[PDB]
Design an enzyme around this catalytic site. Structure first.
Site, PDB file in Angstrom:
ATOM      1  N   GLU A  19       5.455   7.456  -2.039  1.00 35.39           N
ATOM      2  CA  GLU A  19       6.457   6.428  -1.804  1.00 35.39           C
ATOM      3  C   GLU A  19       7.887   6.898  -2.020  1.00 35.39           C
ATOM      4  O   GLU A  19       8.147   8.062  -2.315  1.00 35.39           O
ATOM      5  CB  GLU A  19       6.182   5.260  -2.763  1.00 35.39           C
ATOM      6  CG  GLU A  19       5.452   4.070  -2.157  1.00 35.39           C
ATOM      7  CD  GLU A  19       6.394   3.051  -1.531  1.00 35.39           C
ATOM      8  OE1 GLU A  19       7.517   3.425  -1.122  1.00 35.39           O
ATOM      9  OE2 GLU A  19       6.008   1.866  -1.450  1.00 35.39           O
ATOM     10  N   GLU A  35       1.005   5.917  -7.941  1.00 38.21           N
ATOM     11  CA  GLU A  35      -0.405   5.775  -8.268  1.00 38.21           C
ATOM     12  C   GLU A  35      -1.150   6.914  -8.967  1.00 38.21           C
ATOM     13  O   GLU A  35      -2.380   6.925  -9.010  1.00 38.21           O
ATOM     14  CB  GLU A  35      -1.144   5.244  -7.036  1.00 38.21           C
ATOM     15  CG  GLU A  35      -0.542   3.901  -6.610  1.00 38.21           C
ATOM     16  CD  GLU A  35      -1.124   3.321  -5.342  1.00 38.21           C
ATOM     17  OE1 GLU A  35      -2.324   2.980  -5.337  1.00 38.21           O
ATOM     18  OE2 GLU A  35      -0.366   3.168  -4.359  1.00 38.21           O
ATOM     19  N   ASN A 118       9.557  -2.588  -6.942  1.00 36.18           N
ATOM     20  CA  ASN A 118       8.916  -1.714  -5.968  1.00 36.18           C
ATOM     21  C   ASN A 118       9.867  -0.918  -5.073  1.00 36.18           C
ATOM     22  O   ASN A 118       9.629   0.260  -4.797  1.00 36.18           O
ATOM     23  CB  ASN A 118       7.930  -2.513  -5.120  1.00 36.18           C
ATOM     24  CG  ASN A 118       7.022  -1.625  -4.316  1.00 36.18           C
ATOM     25  OD1 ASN A 118       7.371  -1.217  -3.214  1.00 36.18           O
ATOM     26  ND2 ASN A 118       5.858  -1.288  -4.876  1.00 36.18           N
ATOM     27  N   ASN A 173       8.516  -6.509  -0.883  1.00 34.27           N
ATOM     28  CA  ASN A 173       8.345  -5.065  -0.838  1.00 34.27           C
ATOM     29  C   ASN A 173       9.580  -4.289  -0.371  1.00 34.27           C
ATOM     30  O   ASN A 173      10.471  -4.012  -1.170  1.00 34.27           O
ATOM     31  CB  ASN A 173       7.123  -4.762   0.034  1.00 34.27           C
ATOM     32  CG  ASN A 173       6.466  -3.451  -0.313  1.00 34.27           C
ATOM     33  OD1 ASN A 173       7.129  -2.499  -0.716  1.00 34.27           O
ATOM     34  ND2 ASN A 173       5.151  -3.391  -0.147  1.00 34.27           N
ATOM     35  N   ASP A 227       5.974  -2.741   4.583  1.00 29.93           N
ATOM     36  CA  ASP A 227       6.167  -2.053   3.322  1.00 29.93           C
ATOM     37  C   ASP A 227       7.639  -1.633   3.240  1.00 29.93           C
ATOM     38  O   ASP A 227       8.495  -2.471   2.970  1.00 29.93           O
ATOM     39  CB  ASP A 227       5.213  -0.857   3.206  1.00 29.93           C
ATOM     40  CG  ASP A 227       5.151  -0.290   1.794  1.00 29.93           C
ATOM     41  OD1 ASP A 227       6.151  -0.397   1.059  1.00 29.93           O
ATOM     42  OD2 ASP A 227       4.101   0.269   1.418  1.00 29.93           O
ATOM     43  N   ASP A 230      14.306   0.695   6.768  1.00 30.08           N
ATOM     44  CA  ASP A 230      15.630   1.311   6.841  1.00 30.08           C
ATOM     45  C   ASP A 230      16.231   1.053   8.218  1.00 30.08           C
ATOM     46  O   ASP A 230      15.503   0.904   9.204  1.00 30.08           O
ATOM     47  CB  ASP A 230      15.581   2.822   6.579  1.00 30.08           C
ATOM     48  CG  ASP A 230      15.885   3.181   5.124  1.00 30.08           C
ATOM     49  OD1 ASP A 230      16.687   2.485   4.467  1.00 30.08           O
ATOM     50  OD2 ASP A 230      15.318   4.175   4.635  1.00 30.08           O
ATOM     51  N   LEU A 271       9.822   5.041   4.499  1.00 32.73           N
ATOM     52  CA  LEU A 271      10.501   6.015   5.336  1.00 32.73           C
ATOM     53  C   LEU A 271      11.947   6.209   4.916  1.00 32.73           C
ATOM     54  O   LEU A 271      12.507   5.391   4.184  1.00 32.73           O
ATOM     55  CB  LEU A 271      10.404   5.584   6.805  1.00 32.73           C
ATOM     56  CG  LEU A 271      10.808   4.146   7.148  1.00 32.73           C
ATOM     57  CD1 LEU A 271      12.297   4.072   7.395  1.00 32.73           C
ATOM     58  CD2 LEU A 271      10.065   3.686   8.390  1.00 32.73           C
ATOM     59  N   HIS A 272      12.547   7.296   5.389  1.00 29.06           N
ATOM     60  CA  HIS A 272      13.933   7.608   5.069  1.00 29.06           C
ATOM     61  C   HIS A 272      14.459   8.649   6.044  1.00 29.06           C
ATOM     62  O   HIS A 272      13.752   9.597   6.397  1.00 29.06           O
ATOM     63  CB  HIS A 272      14.037   8.156   3.643  1.00 29.06           C
ATOM     64  CG  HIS A 272      15.345   7.863   2.973  1.00 29.06           C
ATOM     65  ND1 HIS A 272      15.631   6.637   2.411  1.00 29.06           N
ATOM     66  CD2 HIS A 272      16.426   8.644   2.742  1.00 29.06           C
ATOM     67  CE1 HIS A 272      16.829   6.678   1.856  1.00 29.06           C
ATOM     68  NE2 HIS A 272      17.333   7.884   2.042  1.00 29.06           N
ATOM     69  N   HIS A 285      -0.379   6.199   2.991  1.00 32.70           N
ATOM     70  CA  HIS A 285      -1.461   6.136   2.013  1.00 32.70           C
ATOM     71  C   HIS A 285      -2.889   6.367   2.494  1.00 32.70           C
ATOM     72  O   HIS A 285      -3.835   6.143   1.739  1.00 32.70           O
ATOM     73  CB  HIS A 285      -1.359   4.833   1.217  1.00 32.70           C
ATOM     74  CG  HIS A 285      -0.027   4.637   0.561  1.00 32.70           C
ATOM     75  ND1 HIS A 285       0.412   3.411   0.111  1.00 32.70           N
ATOM     76  CD2 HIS A 285       0.966   5.517   0.284  1.00 32.70           C
ATOM     77  CE1 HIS A 285       1.617   3.544  -0.416  1.00 32.70           C
ATOM     78  NE2 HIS A 285       1.975   4.811  -0.324  1.00 32.70           N
TER      79      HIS A 285
HETATM   80 CA   LIG Z   1      14.179   4.565   2.773  1.00 31.58          CA
HETATM   81 CA   LIG Z   2       7.066  -0.185  -1.091  1.00 31.80          CA
END
Ligand SMILES: [Ca+2]
Ligand SMILES: [Ca+2]
Length: 312
Positions: A19, A35, A118, A173, A227, A230, A271-272, A285
Site C-alpha cells: 500500500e 499486513e 488508512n 478509504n 481503494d 489520485d 497508486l501514485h 493484493h
Molecule cells: Ca497515491
Molecule cells: Ca487504502
C-alpha cells in the site's frame, strides 16, 4: 465504457498488503506493508524501494508501547523530506527517511480518542485530509468499519489540530483533493469501499467541508470497491477498484467512469504518479506486489512538488 490495457511492468514483490506508494522530495520511492504480522500480531512496515533493482529495504517497523502498527497510506511533506503515514492501529505518523517516527495524535481536537487511519491527501495549503476506517487506535482492541458505519474523516491542519470533519462511513478509504487552476483547494473526494461509492464535499477552508454528495459510482458487485486514488494533470480521477481487476478513470464531474484500465490482477489497491512523468505505480493484493504502467498524461502535482517560496 472504453477499457485500455497498458503494459504493466513488475516493480517489486512480496509486500503483504502492499500500500501507500509515494515519492519523496528526492525522488525516492516508498511502499508500506500494513499486513505484515509476527505471531498473529501487527508488525507493519514502511519500505524504501530501489527502482533500478526492485530491492526492498525496511526503514521503519512502527510500534508504540509494544503495539505494532498497520501503516497503510502515505503523503510526502513539502517543507521537510518526511512522510505522513496513515496507520490503522496508530493513527497518523510522521516518518523520517532515517526510519525514526513520531505518533501524531492519541486524541482529536475534541478530546475524543483517535481512530486508526488508512489513507491521506495534502491540499496545496498544507492541510492533510485523512480517512479513518478503523476504530480507536491502540491500545484499543482492533476494529474496522467494513460492516458497520463508524469510519471517520479527519483534517490535520497546518496549526497542528487533528479535527474530525465527518463520521459514519462504511470504510472510508482513498482520498483526494481537487484544486482550482490557481491552486485553491475546493473539493474533497472520499472513497467508501464496500458501498461502491465516491463521496464529495466542498472545501470551504482548512478543516471545513460542506455538502456531502454521492459523487461517483464504482462498477461491480464483487467484494471490495474503491481503494486508493489520485488525480492526473487534467483532474481526471484514477481510482483502484479492489476486486474488479480495473482502475476506474472518472472525468472532472464524476458520475460513472469514462474509462477503465485493465490490470493483470484482481486486487489493485493504491497508486501514485512518479513526478514529471506519465508513470503510475500500482500496488495490488492478489500477488502482494508493485507494478507500473504508462498513463495518457502526467499526474497532478502532489503537495511535496509545490514550493513554499515559489512565485508563480
Ligand atoms: Ca497515491
Ligand atoms: Ca487504502
Amino acid at each position: 465504457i472504453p477499457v485500455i490495457e497498458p503494459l504493466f511492468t513488475k516493480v517489486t514483490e512480496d509486500i503483504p498488503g502492499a500500500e501507500g506508494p509515494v515519492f519523496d522530495k528526492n525522488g525516492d520511492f516508498y511502499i508500506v506493508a500494513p499486513e505484515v504480522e509476527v505471531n498473529g500480531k501487527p508488525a507493519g512496515e514502511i519500505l524504501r524501494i530501489d527502482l533500478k533493482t526492485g530491492k526492498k529495504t525496511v526503514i521503519c517497523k512502527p510500534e508504540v508501547n509494544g503495539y505494532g502498527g498497520i501503516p497503510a497510506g502515505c503523503q510526502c511533506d513539502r517543507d521537510a523530506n518526511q512522510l505522513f503515514v496513515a496507520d490503522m492501529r496508530l493513527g497518523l505518523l510522521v516518518v523520517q527517511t532515517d526510519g525514526t517516527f513520531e505518533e501524531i495524535a492519541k486524541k482529536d481536537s475534541e478530546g475524543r480518542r483517535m481512530q486508526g487511519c488508512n489513507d491521506c491527501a495534502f491540499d496545496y495549503e498544507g492541510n492533510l485530509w485523512i480517512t479513518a476506517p478503523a476504530g480507536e487506535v491502540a491500545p484499543a482492541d482492533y476494529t474496522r468499519s467494513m460492516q458497520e458505519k463508524f469510519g471517520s474523516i479527519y483534517c490535520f491542519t497546518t496549526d497542528g489540530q487533528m479535527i474530525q470533519v465527518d463520521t459514519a462511513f462504511q470504510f472510508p478509504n482513498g482520498i483526494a483533493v481537487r484544486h482550482m487552476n490557481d491552486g485553491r483547494p475546493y473539493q474533497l473526494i472520499v472513497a467508501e469501499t464496500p458501498t461502491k461509492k465516491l463521496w464529495s464535499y466542498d472545501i470551504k477552508g482548512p478543516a471545513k467541508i460542506e455538502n456531502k454528495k454521492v459523487w461517483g459510482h464504482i462498477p461491480g458487485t464483487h467484494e471490495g470497491g474503491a481503494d486508493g486514488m489520485d488525480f492526473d494533470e487534467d483532474n481526471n480521477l484514477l481510482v483502484a477498484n479492489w476486486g474488479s481487476s480495473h482502475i476506474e478513470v472518472f472525468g472532472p464531474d464524476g458520475g460513472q467512469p469514462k474509462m477503465r484500465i485493465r490490470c493483470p490482477f484482481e486486487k489493485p489497491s493504491n497508486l501514485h504518479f512518479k513526478p514529471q512523468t506519465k508513470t503510475i505505480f500500482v500496488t495490488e493484493h492478489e500477488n502482494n506486489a508493485v507494478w507500473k504502467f504508462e498513463w495518457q498524461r502526467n499526474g497532478k502535482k502532489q503537495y511535496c512538488e509545490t514550493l513554499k517560496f515559489g512565485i508563480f
